[PDB]
Design a protein around this ligand. Structure first.
Ligand SMILES: Nc1ncnc2c1ncn2[C@@H]1O[C@H](COP(=O)(O)OP(=O)(O)NP(=O)(O)O)[C@@H](O)[C@H]1O
Ligand SMILES: Nc1ncnc2c1ncn2[C@@H]1O[C@H](COP(=O)(O)OP(=O)(O)NP(=O)(O)O)[C@@H](O)[C@H]1O
Ligand SMILES: C/C1=C/C(=O)O[C@@H]2C[C@@H](CC[C@H](C)/C=C\C=C\CC1)O[C@@](O)([C@@H]1CSC(=O)N1)C2
Ligand SMILES: C/C1=C/C(=O)O[C@@H]2C[C@@H](CC[C@H](C)/C=C\C=C\CC1)O[C@@](O)([C@@H]1CSC(=O)N1)C2
Ligand SMILES: [Ca+2]
Ligand SMILES: [Ca+2]
Ligand SMILES: [Ca+2]
Ligand SMILES: [Ca+2]
Lengths: 345, 345
């Protein structure tokens, strides 16, 4: 009766802890600091692990520094982005079994876990983090891969934009340290307008939408239409020069690519996952926009769990603990025996 | 548990004492007197040791005459000017280990120690003494060498100028003894004008800025705009026929040569070191001038420690005593073993 580990590796944050817990004990940056003779590196670009040696370092820091546990004494549940290439998943397995000597392991799809966290086996998930946005449709637990929509625009991109659009008010946020200041602003004051034009007009004509922000040094600053113009990019990505359709449109597209029988259920089950879905008013805006694109008689529902910055991790805590999941693990025996081509079944 | 020595060799003064002390016990002229059959020699020109046999004499006078200690019984911390040539540093090491038989030693950068004395690991230092003026930017303890600005104009040059500009009032300061009298005037009455033209006008139209000076022989003399015209040379070196940009401009230039990420911090951390930064009102003038050249939204701060004539020495007292510095010493064993090429790492 040993304890299972759940480690959710995202582009910005690593979320880690023990299965069965309500929340992860460790939440820290997915970064590997390097010198010029910091110079940070984000090992995971757009939800995909791009540098493996750096990634080994984060896992090493997860077990020994953060969780303070022995890797070979706990079965480990890792998480991956939707449509992660085969070879990527095999490499994770190779590293855990050989370099960390884990007794058992399994790699789960992030969007699916989020759904599970909402108590659902079927629905369409909007998972938008720091590095990538996905629309993942799911039926009876299985993610339909031909219907998944990806969008390389998330929190970091929204932070970069807000830095830009604060410069036109006269402020000067350009450094990496100053960027973390803007990220805080984004997380504290930004919201999604129910109707952009109206909202731009309310900002143009009055000061009712202005808020004060106390900087580290003690000075206070004012921000206006930026509050909703920043997260608006989600609905209109051409603000930052991207022709990609908005999140609401890709949600519609994700649903239309699916079998007709399941769409009614998908529409009825729009779960939101990830930190970039935490903007106040994002739930009302998605309802509105989804209604416009859909047929008139469709019942639309957008589920937005309050703890949705950690829905994935939670999904894995719940899964790792389930009785029906224990059979699906990969023992070190199975791996050494069967090999990398066993993590597909 | 033997006591460590700290010896700061400057162009004008030698500052020496035991690590852990608040202030150095010995402060004396960096001069070697010679005859015509005095004729003084300053062994250190512009912060660089130029005559080694004379320099041996000052170190001999430091240990035996001034500090009254045995060189081979104390690890010795020497100081050097920014961008001191490799070969210069190797020669210091050779002399301490072979001629003074020191058990351990280390050579530190003056501007960096000053910073440490202010309780900072990062910032931009204005170190202006009797022979040289440097702008030294520093990040996480390391002095960025490509961003250091040098300026061969300090206290002695300001003293030579004041002797010149007192002649146009009718006084006759020309001899070496009389020069030390002018240096005293410079140190007692000179200040830096917040605005030169205004100040020249206040001197032209009234006598509110005049001060009396009691000479050695008992007679009193009056000095006016010279009080601020002398130190003004720092901000406008073309007063003494030098095309070099002023201290405020080189401070700006030193910052712009650095990586963009660190400039905000550099501006926020302008520490002043050396006797030529002791002019009353030099802190207000640097704030003013630095603001004009910088962007409008930049927070500028000029730190001016009251004990800043001995900031370097103090920096070394603090460093020599640190726990993390003990590993960085150079034992006589290491030197005799490894050789001169070990003092670079
Ligand atoms: N209240 C908030 N409002 C808006 N954005 C937020 C809020 N809280 C967190 N974020 C953003 O959420 C992002 C991190 O969330 P997370 O879902 O953990 O991303 P990730 O998993 O690290 N990377 P990815 O693989 O793209 O999910 C950052 O861009 C945060 O700034
Ligand atoms: N109150 C003062 N006002 C102006 N100048 C001063 C004052 N006190 C000392 N000085 C000058 O400070 C200089 C000596 O300071 P110091 O920083 O010890 O120079 P140094 O280290 O001997 N030579 P360097 O290697 O150039 O620093 C002399 O030119 C003094 O006249
Ligand atoms: C509370 C918090 C949340 C977070 O998500 O940080 C992550 C990680 C962070 C790493 C680089 C910074 C300097 C190091 C320190 C961080 C502490 C964690 C900060 O880079 C992000 O900020 C990026 C860049 S700017 C943005 O919008 N996303 C996301
Ligand atoms: C209190 C004091 C401070 C000092 O800094 O002296 C140093 C050393 C001094 C050496 C020559 C004189 C005669 C010898 C005696 C000195 C006693 C120390 C005098 O030559 C300076 O004066 C030069 C020349 S004139 C000037 O402006 N810098 C700087
Ligand atoms: Ca994620
Ligand atoms: Ca568009
Ligand atoms: Ca000096
Ligand atoms: Ca000039």
């Amino acid at each position: 009766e040993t304890t299972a580990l759940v480690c959710d590796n995202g582009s910005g944050l690593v979320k880690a802890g023990f299965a069965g817990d309500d929340a992860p004990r460790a939440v820290f940056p997915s970064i590997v600091g390097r010198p010029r003779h910091l110079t940070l590196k984000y090992p995971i670009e757009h939800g995909i692990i791009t540098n493996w040696d750096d990634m080994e370092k984060i896992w090493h820091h997860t077990f020994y520094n953060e969780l303070r546990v022995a890797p070979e004494e706990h079965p480990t549940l890792l998480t991956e982005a939707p449509l992660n290439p085969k070879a990527n998943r095999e490499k994770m397995t190779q590293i855990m079994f050989e370099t960390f000597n884990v007794p058992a392991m399994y790699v789960a799809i992030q969007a699916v876990l989020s759904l599970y966290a909402s108590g659902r086996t079927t629905g369409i998930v909007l998972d938008s983090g720091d590095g990538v946005t996905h629309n993942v449709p799911i039926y009876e637990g299985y993610a339909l891969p031909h219907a998944i929509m990806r969008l390389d625009l998330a929190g970091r991109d929204l932070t970069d934009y807000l830095m830009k659009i604060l410069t036109e008010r006269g402020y000067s946020f350009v450094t990496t340290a100053e960027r973390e200041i803007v990220r805080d602003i984004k997380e504290k004051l930004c919201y999604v307008a129910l109707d952009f034009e109206n909202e731009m007009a309310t900002a143009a004509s009055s000061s009712s939408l202005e808020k004060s922000y106390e900087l580290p040094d003690g000075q206070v600053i004012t921000i206006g239409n930026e509050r909703f113009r920043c997260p608006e990019t989600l609905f209109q990505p051409s603000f930052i020069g991207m022709e990609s359709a908005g999140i609401h449109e890709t949600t519609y597209n994700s649903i239309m690519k699916c079998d007709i029988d399941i769409r009614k259920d998908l529409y009825a089950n729009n779960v939101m996952s990830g930190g970039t879905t935490m903007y106040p008013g994002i739930a009302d805006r998605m309802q509105k926009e989804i209604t416009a694109l859909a047929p008139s008689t469709m019942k639309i529902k957008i589920i937005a769990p309050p703890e949705r910055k950690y829905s994935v991790w939670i999904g894995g805590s719940i899964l790792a603990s389930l009785s029906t999941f224990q059979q699906m693990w990969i023992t070190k025996q199975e791996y050494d025996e069967a090999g990398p081509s066993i993590v597909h079944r």
